[PDB]
Each structure stands twice: as C-alpha cells, then as structure tokens.
Design a protein around this ligand. Structure first.
Ligand code: TRP
Ligand code: MG
Ligand code: MG
Ligand code: MG
Ligand code: MG
Ligand code: MG
Ligand code: MG
Ligand code: MG
Ligand code: MG
Ligand code: MG
Ligand code: MG
Ligand code: MG
Ligand code: MG
Ligand code: MG
Ligand code: MG
Ligand code: MG
Ligand code: MG
Ligand code: MG
Ligand code: MG
Ligand code: MG
Ligand code: MG
Ligand code: MG
Ligand code: MG
Ligand code: MG
Ligand code: MG
Ligand code: MG
Lengths: 64, 143, 16, 117, 201
RNA sequence: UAGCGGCGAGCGAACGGGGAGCAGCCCAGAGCCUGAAUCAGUGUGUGUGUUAGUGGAAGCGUCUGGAAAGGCGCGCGAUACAGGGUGACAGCCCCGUACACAAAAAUGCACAUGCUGUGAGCUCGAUGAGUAGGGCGGGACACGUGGUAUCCUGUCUGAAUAUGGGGGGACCAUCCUCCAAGGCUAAAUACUCCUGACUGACCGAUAGUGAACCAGUACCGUGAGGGAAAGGCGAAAAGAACCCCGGCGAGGGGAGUGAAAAAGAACCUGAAACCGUGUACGUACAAGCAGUGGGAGCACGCUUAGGCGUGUGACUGCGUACCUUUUGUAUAAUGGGUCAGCGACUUAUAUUCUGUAGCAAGGUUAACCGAAUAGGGGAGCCGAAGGGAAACCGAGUCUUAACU
C-alpha cells in the first residue's frame, strides 16, 4: 500500500526549490496586543525548517 | 557460454541476515541493542512523534489555501513549440503534442530558452523575455 | 497439577 | 527451498568432541559440556604460550644460579660480569652448559669475575 | 558489416550497430537472469500458525505447573504445526527496459559473429516432415546443436527437430536471449536476418 | 492528490484519460388485424463435445555383475527422446507417447423443427402522489453538521404535472442539462465441495494435510468439543525343511535360501545420549571448574640409534564452567539432567538513499492487445523553473508606497 502523507504536516510545510521546506512562524495567532510590533513584525514572513527537524518533516511528507 | 556470464562488480550486495552467531557481526541481539520499545517485534514509534512533546507539525500553524485554478494551468518552455507540429502553437495543439495535458485551460510561454523555427503563438500568454525571443526568431504573437 | 504446600497459604505466604 | 540441516550439524559437533578426546566424563562425551572444555583449553594454551617463556627463563636462571654459587659467586654478580665482560652476550638457556659441561661453566665464571675485578 | 552467406557466397550486408558492436557482459547478464526468472511459477505451501489445524485453547495454565509458558498448540516453537514465515505463491517476473532488452540482443548477436557461431544462409528448409531428413541436412552442414531462425517458418522444418534434442527451430519473432547463447551454433536464414535487423532497429 | 479529521490517530473521492466487454427492451391500453416476432418448458432431427475403446515405429553384440537399461562397438525409428515399469541409468523388453481412428446407448452445447404456454403488428392514446419537497430523529455518501449540496427513512407533513419538474455541493439569477416516484435484460467480474488433463528453483515421514498407515481413528471429555502416535526385509518369500539345548516353552546354535542373514521379519542406512565385555597405561599420604605449560615411567610402533610417532599421565607452574542480566557475577543471582531432530529479522506494496546497468534534457510505460519474457500500447509518472497563501509574474519572484 502507498504510504499515506501525515496529513497534518502537509498543511504546514511546502517543499521549496533546493528541497527545503519553509513554514509559518508560531506565536502569531492570538494574545498579540502585548507583543512588540518588532516581534510580531518579524513573525510574518515564512521561514525554513531547521536542520534538526528536517528528519521529522520528511518522514511526514514522503510525497512532498 | 551460459555459465561464463556474471554481473557487474558491486551490483549485487549480499544484504544483512543477522541473528546468526558471534562471527556474523549481527548475532544475538541483531543490531537492535538492549531492550526498550525499539527492540521487540513490531517496536518503533510513529512518524512525527517526538516523545509525548508537542510535535513540530503541531506546534506550527497551518497556512494553506489551494488554488484549484492553478491545477489547470500549464507552463511552456521555449524548447517546446518547435515540436508542436504545424508552426502554430495553439490553446491546445501543444495538448496534442503531449506537452500540456488535456485538463489544462491556460498556459504561459516562459523564457526557458532556445527557439529557432519561426512560430506563431495564439491564445496563450507569454513573458516579456519569451515574446522577445520568439519575435527575434521570426515568430508572431497574436492573442 | 500443584503440590499441596504450594497451594497452602500458611507455608507459602511465610514472609510478609 | 527447505534445508535438511543436521548433516552439517553433527559435522560441527563431532568437530568439537574430537578436540575433547581425553577429558573426564561429560567433558569428552557431551557436546554442550565439551564445547566449553574445548574453548577453555584453548584459552589456557594462548595464555601458557606466553607463560612457557616465563617458566623456562626462571628455570634457567634458577640453575644458572646454583652453578654460579657452586663456583663461588651469586647470579647477580655473575650476569653483571658477563655484561661488563667487554660487552659479550649469551643466552640464559645456553648457560645449559651449567649442567652438561661444568668446566666450561667455571670457565665462564672466571671470565666474569675478571671483569668485576 | 558484411556476412559470409555460407552456401551461395553472396554477402548479406547488415547494420554495424546491430552486428558489429562491443559485448556488454553485464547488460546481457541482467537480461538472461531476468529471462530465467519469470520462467518461474509461484505455487507454494506452508501454513503459518494461523492456518495449522487445531483449536486456540491455551495448552496449560500460565503459572503453576512447572512448565514453560505455552500459548497456542500451533506455535512455531512447538512440534507439529508452525512455520514462522510460511511462504505464499509469488511472482518473480522482472522488468527489463525496452532499450535494455534490445541492447542485450545486439551484444549477443554481435558476439556470435565474433565467434562465428552465427552462420547465415539464403533459405533453409527441409523437403518433408521427417526427422531423419533434417538429421541428414545437419550432418551434411556439420551441425548438432542449432537454433535455426527461419524466415516465416514451415510445417515440415518444425516437425523434424521436434524430436532432435539439441536442435530447435524458431520463427523470426521467436528469438529469445537464452537460446541465442544456449545452442552451440545459431543458423538464421538471410531472410530472417533482415527481419531481426529491423526488430532491433 | 482535493477533501474529511479530538484537523489527533487515521479516513480518503471525483472530474477527466487509457483498456476489458458492449445491447437493449417491456408494463402503466384499447381499436383493428390476431395468434404473425420472441421466451421458457418440451418431443424429434443434426452436428459437435462427453461417458468404454482401436491401431500405433524401430537392438544387437560383448564387458563388469546376484541382476544390465550401465561401459565399449555397430545398426535402426523418430510428426513417437512426455512419462512409468522392468534384478543398476532403456527412443528400439513392457505400458505409452506422436499420429490416425471408434459409439450400440445416455447425455452437455449449438442450431433446425414438432407439441404446449406465450405474445408479435399497424392506428390513436397514456407517461408511475401519501410520491417530490419540508419539520424532528438516525443512517448512508471519502465528507465526523460543518457554510454541507446529494442519497435512505422511523416520525409528523405534503406539491407541481410540459407554459411542468430534477440536477449542476449552502443559496439566488441566468444558462446548460436531464425526466424520479413500474419492471426486464447478455458480456467483460467472483468462487471451487467436485470431474479431467497438465505444471512447479513446493514438502519428503518432528517435513508435507491432523491423517503417506483401516485417522477424525485410539484416547480424553456429561457435552459442545479436543485429538495422537505409527512409512521402507529382498530383485524375487526363495519368509529359514531338518538336527541340537529348553518347559511338546521364550530364546538360541547349526543347517538351508539369497549378492548380502553382519537383509531373519523387534528386518535398508543404523548417528548421539546411555550400558557393558576385552586390552594398554594411571590410581589406595592425597584436597578444589578437572584443563593447560612442563614432564619422567610404562605399553607400543619407529628409526638403525639419536631425549621420534601413538596411548597413558606419577610429579609439577598456572588455573573459580557457559549463557543471560548488570556499575559489577566463581558467585550462594537467571537458564540448561543428557543426546538427536525441529525452533526466531520474513513476504508484499509504497518511499528514499547507496551500488550497478540502460539511455539522456529527456527517461519510462500501466492496464490491455499479443505472432505471449518479443512486438504493440506513452493513458500516465518523474525531470527540464522558480517565487507567492492566491490572482499572477517569470530567470526571476515575494515582501512594501518603494526598496540602499
Ligand atoms: N491433604 C492435604 C491438604 C490439602 C489438599 N489439597 C490442598 C490444597 C491446598 C492446601 C492444602 C491441601 C494435607 O496433607 O494437609
Ligand atoms: Mg491570526
Ligand atoms: Mg536481549
Ligand atoms: Mg534500558
Ligand atoms: Mg534501545
Ligand atoms: Mg498526454
Ligand atoms: Mg616475556
Ligand atoms: Mg482462541
Ligand atoms: Mg521444567
Ligand atoms: Mg506443518
Ligand atoms: Mg514488452
Ligand atoms: Mg492400445
Ligand atoms: Mg510401441
Ligand atoms: Mg416518467
Ligand atoms: Mg435487476
Ligand atoms: Mg505426519
Ligand atoms: Mg528417517
Ligand atoms: Mg536393519
Ligand atoms: Mg602413593
Ligand atoms: Mg577430593
Ligand atoms: Mg592444601
Ligand atoms: Mg544488581
Ligand atoms: Mg552495561
Ligand atoms: Mg569474575
Ligand atoms: Mg556451588
Ligand atoms: Mg547460578
């Protein structure tokens, strides 16, 4: 049987060009008013999944 | 001569057997280590699981939204079109040259280099760099 | 089956 | 493809029992017991190949010593002599001559004494 | 690439790419092995503990008897009934790319010439469905072990040789890799050669 | 994949495309013409399969041997060298095989008709209401009520009727498309108690069916039900007449059969644990994982000696088994009375990496067709373009009014 993609992860990562993954930062979905504009500002643009977690994500998205 | 053939050297790695004695290198324990969930028949833990800790693919927020229109738009390389067969690169036609796929309803032409034979492209979209390359090769781009 | 001493509580329980 | 096994098995087993020939009781009869006996014999040997060279040297040194004393000189002085006896090197076993040729020995003792004078 | 037409010395002229190419051993070895596989049928026994015949009653108490644990009388450790990894009927068919198959035939032909084990002829056929006839033709041709790939294949040439053991006769399409290597000499009519010439491109 | 989802674990389509096979008809009805198409049930006929059958080629000499099919020599058949048997391995001894033939009777299948039952045809009509839809409760749809179309209905309701009605995933308009609330329908698809024939990189008596054997037996259980062990004399019984010890015994020794009796029925091979008889050497002042290094004597062979081979092993240095599990085990911590046989990292499908092979900006086909490992089939999949949630743009793009 085909592997099934760990569906939850599919909805949080996108394979990039060189084979990276990029995600949305956490900590930006509520209880915001008390957080610096600088902090929140830096949390908008997507970011690459780190070297340490690559192992996990790939195992979640065999068909990425 | 049917027993004088032999495979390319290092094309047939033997492959671990394990559980067969001290010498083998993979005896007794069979490279599984001592005890724990990871030994034991049917051991292991599921993907993404990282101890009871909240997993990466759950700490991080979802951000999807799937275009669905994108699913029916193809992209065309300059390298094609020469292979379209008939010097007219049309809404489909490419479709018939098996370079698009039936369901497609839209298509850009993209400077993916190399066009020679003059060609007229019709009903497609085409980038600034692609138009220029087509035209500079005697091509014509009518909407 | 089992020998009677093993089944019997007084001899078997011995050190609680 | 099912594998009979068991013809090769007794090959392995007899290969061991043969090595156990001579051992007492189970050690020579019963594989499970023999395979151990066979191993530890091996272990001692590997050890005792190194011991052999120890045991004999002190055997030699022991009898070198009496003969030296017999010619009125301790082993200590006597090897020191031969050492100092203008270089010169000569096995402690080859001092075999202590048992089979006692004049040659005494002769060696003198040569040694001289260097110590 | 010219080929000595044997009988009516004529030369046939064949493609250098399909008859003069270097012998790629590995590449043929993959295809011959592959062909030998797939000769296979599955057809295989053995009952896992799930399919040996007995009830699923625990043979005796967990604790209490002086006995080893014991759970199912069908256990592979127990005697009658077991087989830990009982096999099933299975399919050994391999793939072999189109271009690799062709690649192998070429390396094989182009080696048969190089050992002149391939003797090509204008026409080859026996005059009646009688083995003895064919036996004689071969005798006269100095042959025992032969493949003989005919152009279109005829009744009589086939019925003879059905009973000669070291000799078979195939039509042009019937050419397989093991056979080319199998027989000591491959004959092939000059008519068949042209067929093969194209089949391999 | 899109989606569903304590958006956890998991579940998982469709559109469209390539293939297998293709087939369409009745009722809701009366008039005329009337039994006219057709279907089944049935009798006959015919053909074709089935259930017994027939014919079926060609080898001898010699050697070894208890025995030739084996070796060696020389012939012969082959549309027959599939296979089994025969005193060892047989194309030519036997039974077959290829091939060619055969049915008195009964039957499967096709057609052709007879008998029964059935309706065909033209004209003019008709067009499936307690239904659709809705409310409540559930259930089905990949879809968990969710913004949830759609389907089913336990419950209470309830239309329009061709200018009419359903659907197009809340919903409305327009457009498009279909006609529910009656039925029938062959093929491609599934399965094997059983019949026939053929095949296997399937097992070979602890294997393989539980059962190679008079096995669902003996046995166990009130019962449901559970459920064994156990194959081989020899080519041929030629299976041991007769004599002797013995209890008109058991068992044995002769005799005789046989290639073999050490193949004697408790019978091919006959391992190992285990138990004896015989011989060599050691052993009754000596203390412990029993061996190992040394090492005399004795018995035996040697050699021509020559501190040499074999067996034993006084005396002597060192020396607390194995597995497991542990920070650590002689451990007085686990496991093993012993032998033999069996007994544990497999298989399938996905995915990724390494090796290797093919080809290369291309690579490769899936099902399926098939002259069946070929050839066809490029539906499709991967790659050659990325960025962005997305529209979209594109060697760029996104971010921002804009980027140093
Ligand atoms: N008869 C036993 C007693 C007994 C019988 N069954 C038992 C079971 C458990 C304990 C004791 C018993 C005795 O000798 O005393
Ligand atoms: Mg937010
Ligand atoms: Mg362990
Ligand atoms: Mg642990
Ligand atoms: Mg571990
Ligand atoms: Mg296409
Ligand atoms: Mg030293
Ligand atoms: Mg049970
Ligand atoms: Mg026990
Ligand atoms: Mg079994
Ligand atoms: Mg193919
Ligand atoms: Mg007959
Ligand atoms: Mg015959
Ligand atoms: Mg209707
Ligand atoms: Mg029906
Ligand atoms: Mg059995
Ligand atoms: Mg046996
Ligand atoms: Mg016997
Ligand atoms: Mg004494
Ligand atoms: Mg004692
Ligand atoms: Mg003491
Ligand atoms: Mg402890
Ligand atoms: Mg440890
Ligand atoms: Mg210790
Ligand atoms: Mg003890
Ligand atoms: Mg212990």
């Amino acid at each position: 049987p085909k592997i099934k993609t760990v569906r939850g992860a599919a909805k949080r990562f996108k394979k990039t060009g060189k084979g990276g993954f990029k995600h949305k930062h956490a900590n930006l979905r509520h209880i915001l008013t008390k957080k610096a504009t600088k902090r929140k500002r830096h949390l908008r643009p997507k970011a690459m999944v780190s070297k340490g977690d690559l192992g996990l994500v790939i195992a979640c998205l065999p068909y990425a | 001569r049917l027993n004088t053939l032999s495979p390319a050297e290092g094309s047939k790695k033997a492959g671990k057997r394990l559980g067969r004695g001290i010498g083998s290198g993979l005896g007794k324990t069979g490279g599984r280590g001592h005890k724990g969930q990871k030994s034991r028949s049917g051991g292991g833990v599921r993907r993404g699981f990282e101890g009871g800790q909240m997993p990466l693919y759950r700490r991080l927020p979802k951000f999807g939204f799937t275009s669905r229109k994108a699913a029916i738009t193809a992209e065309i390389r300059l390298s094609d079109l020469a292979k379209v067969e008939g010097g007219v690169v049309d809404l489909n036609t490419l479709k018939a040259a098996n370079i698009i796929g039936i369901q497609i309803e839209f298509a850009k032409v993209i400077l993916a280099g190399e066009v020679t034979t003059p060609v007229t492209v019709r009903g497609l979209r085409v980038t600034k760099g692609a138009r220029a390359a087509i035209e500079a090769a005697g091509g014509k781009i009518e909407e | 089956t089992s020998k009677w001493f093993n089944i019997d509580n007084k001899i078997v329980d011995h050190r609680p | 493809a099912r594998v009979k096994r068991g013809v090769i098995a007794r090959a392995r087993h007899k290969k061991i029992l043969k090595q156990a020939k001579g051992y007492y009781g189970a050690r020579s009869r019963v594989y499970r017991v023999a395979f151990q006996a066979v191993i530890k014999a091996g272990q001692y040997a590997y050890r005792d190949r190194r011991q052999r060279k120890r045991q004999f040297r002190q055997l030699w040194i022991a009898r070198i010593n009496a003969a030296a004393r017999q010619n009125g000189i301790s082993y200590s002085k006597f090897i020191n002599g031969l050492k100092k006896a203008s270089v010169e090197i000569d096995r402690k076993i080859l001092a075999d001559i202590a048992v089979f040729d006692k004049v040659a020995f005494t002769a060696l003792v003198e040569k040694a004494k001289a260097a110590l004078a | 690439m010219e080929l000595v037409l044997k009988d009516a010395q004529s030369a046939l002229t064949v493609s250098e790419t399909t008859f003069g190419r270097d012998f790629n051993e590995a590449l043929v070895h993959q295809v011959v092995v592959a062909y030998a596989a797939g000769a296979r049928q599955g057809t295989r026994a053995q009952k896992t503990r799930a399919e040996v015949t007995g009830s699923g009653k625990k043979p005796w108490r967990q604790k209490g008897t002086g006995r080893a644990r014991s759970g199912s009388i069908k256990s592979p450790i127990w005697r009658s009934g077991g087989v830990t990894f009982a096999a099933r009927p299975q399919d050994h068919s391999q793939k072999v790319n189109k271009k690799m198959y062709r690649g192998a035939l070429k390396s094989i032909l182009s080696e048969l010439v190089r050992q002149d084990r391939l003797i090509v002829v204008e026409k080859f056929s026996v005059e009646a469905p009688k083995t003895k006839l064919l036996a004689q033709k071969l005798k006269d041709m100095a042959l025992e072990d032969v493949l003989i790939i005919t152009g279109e294949l005829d009744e009589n040439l086939f019925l003879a040789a059905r009973n000669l053991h070291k000799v078979d006769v195939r039509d042009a399409t019937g050419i397989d890799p093991v056979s080319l290597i199998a027989f000591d000499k491959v004959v092939m009519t000059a008519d068949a050669v042209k067929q093969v010439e194209e089949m391999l491109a």
